[PDB]
Symmetry: C3
């Protein structure tokens, strides 16, 4: 009889990983948009009227919104247990990941800004049969014919479009972006995002042109911040309370502007639950 494995293992270090969060998504939309800074939180979009050259006297103004999160860490937890991983660093890291997921969801779904609410009449298409066939994406490409950048859809909507393509003889082309593969139609890629709503089937598909110089969609952030951990993001120390809880404030300032109304189109009423029966 010799030394055991558990007894010997009592003298060994384990390799501890930082906590893993399964809700982290690649957040493609934030990576694909162009971001313009807004010096003091107000952004006025002037327009030619009825496009002599006249301007409208009541242009829309976009006010940057603020979202906050208080991160509380006991001082004994950070004082004692910060080796080899900093406790406050990981706490704030996971907080900021969750906050940026919420930020992408609000870029798509907010009621003030947000693509699915700021789509002009005439830029809204409906499916003919329910499933997203190639004809529907050609309708979308008609609405944003000028210089489309990408499609935005739920991954299940992308799978439904692929099934429709496979029912026809068409294999859609594929491209590589950010080290990942995406499906394209007529050269405009389909970008996945689980933040696009999906309720009993019945999702939506978007087509965007991005850029300030092309009069497309632009994101808006606040450039100079105290703390300033990122683009429109700040972390600040709030203080310590009587129970020895140290608090941190995380603030994120963002908005979104569609510069001209033909920069965005939405295909509505997309059904993702249809499967073909192949019989030969």
């Amino acid at each position: 009889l010799a030394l055991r494995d558990v007894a010997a293992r009592q003298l060994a270090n384990a390799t501890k990983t930082v906590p893993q969060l399964r809700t982290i998504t690649p957040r493609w939309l934030v990576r694909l948009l162009h971001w313009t800074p807004v010096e003091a939180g107000i952004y006025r979009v002037n327009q030619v009227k009825d496009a002599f050259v006249d301007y409208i006297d009541n242009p829309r103004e976009y006010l940057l919104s603020a979202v906050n999160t208080v991160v509380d860490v006991h001082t004994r937890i950070s004082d004692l247990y910060s080796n080899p991983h900093d406790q406050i660093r990981e706490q704030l890291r996971l907080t900021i990941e969750i906050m940026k997921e919420r930020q992408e969801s609000e870029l798509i779904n907010s009621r003030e800004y947000g693509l699915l609410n700021n789509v002009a009449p005439g830029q809204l298409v409906h499916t003919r049969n329910g499933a997203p066939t190639p004809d529907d994406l050609d309708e979308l490409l008609i609405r944003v014919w000028k210089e489309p950048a990408f499609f935005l859809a739920h991954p299940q909507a992308i799978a439904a479009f692929g099934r429709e393509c496979t029912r026809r003889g068409v294999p859609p082309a594929t491209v590589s972006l950010f080290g990942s593969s995406f499906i394209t139609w007529r050269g405009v890629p389909l970008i996945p995002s689980d933040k696009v709503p999906l309720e009993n089937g019945k999702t939506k598909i978007l087509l965007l042109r991005v850029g300030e110089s092309r009069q497309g969609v632009v994101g808006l952030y606040q450039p100079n911040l105290p703390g300033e951990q990122g683009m429109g993001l700040s972390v600040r120390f709030m203080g310590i309370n009587r129970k020895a809880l140290a608090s941190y404030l995380v603030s994120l300032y963002c908005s979104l502007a569609v510069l001209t109304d033909d920069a965005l189109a939405v295909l509505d009423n997309v059904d993702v639950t249809q499967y073909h029966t192949y019989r030969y």
Copy 2:
């Protein structure tokens, strides 16, 4: 018909002043007095 004044004014910056307070007075008395420092908040006059 040409460009209007309000429509053209939509593209112009306004010159914003700092807020004006009407209760500011010259406060002459504070300017006229002599001020002596007190090292630890107590001043004894013998």
Copy 3:
């Protein structure tokens, strides 16, 4: 620890967790300023 001191070790050694004690010290700002 060595068990029953081949050389074996105990599989449930005692672990000591450092404890924290705190005290809040309040000072009026006028008392420290003046």
